[PDB]
Amino acid sequence: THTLQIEEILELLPHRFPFLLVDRVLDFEEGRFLRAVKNVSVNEPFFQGHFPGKPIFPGVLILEAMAQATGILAFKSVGKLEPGELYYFAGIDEARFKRPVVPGDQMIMEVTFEKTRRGLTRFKGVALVDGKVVCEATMMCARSR
């Protein structure tokens, strides 16, 4: 098991507060999969804005956390970002939000590589909380410029 703490993540991803959404990496295999953890706390800034009073983690941020997880997986499988290279969310497909995620929840994500063609990469993402599937999506991310 190849875990990554928050210092290694900070060295791999450029995102910073308030848009860094991967707290830990439980395991990963180059070119195959990565499992990461997002701790959901009520002390996060978006919780004062999305439906104030009934705190529920927004689904689009679940998708962003999965996209950052694939970003880690890609930087570990291919090189990290060379000067000028950016890592883009290019598309989303077949995404379903199945169960609401609330503060106190620990969301475990598994992203797995499907197909690649010149920097364009399709992934499958699944997010779970306490053994129940909470979200599933197909994503495509590109490296460019």
């Binding site: 290019a90 598309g91 197909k115 063609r117 010149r118 920097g119 364009l120 495509m140 590109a142 460019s144």
Partner: protein, 76 residues
């Protein structure tokens, strides 16, 4: 009737914002028409919706020119 070639060139011009006059049979999407990596995916999906079909990934990788799309739609 509208020829398969009429339909395909119509879609490619709309998807890649190119004049319908410039979309030739041997035009490569990437070089000749300047399409990026995601224009190819949208372009295959547009073909799929147009002819009511599903194009598997192995065949989709082969559609890189206008002629390839027409050929795929009408039998080898």
């Amino acid at each position: 009737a509208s020829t398969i070639e009429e339909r395909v060139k119509k879609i490619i011009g709309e998807q890649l914002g190119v004049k319908q006059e410039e979309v030739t049979n041997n035009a490569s999407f990437v070089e000749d028409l300047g399409a990026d990596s995601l224009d190819t995916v949208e372009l295959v999906m547009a073909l799929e919706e147009e002819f009511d079909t599903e194009i598997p990934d192995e065949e989709a990788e082969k559609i890189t020119t206008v002629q390839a799309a027409i050929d795929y739609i009408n039998g080898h």
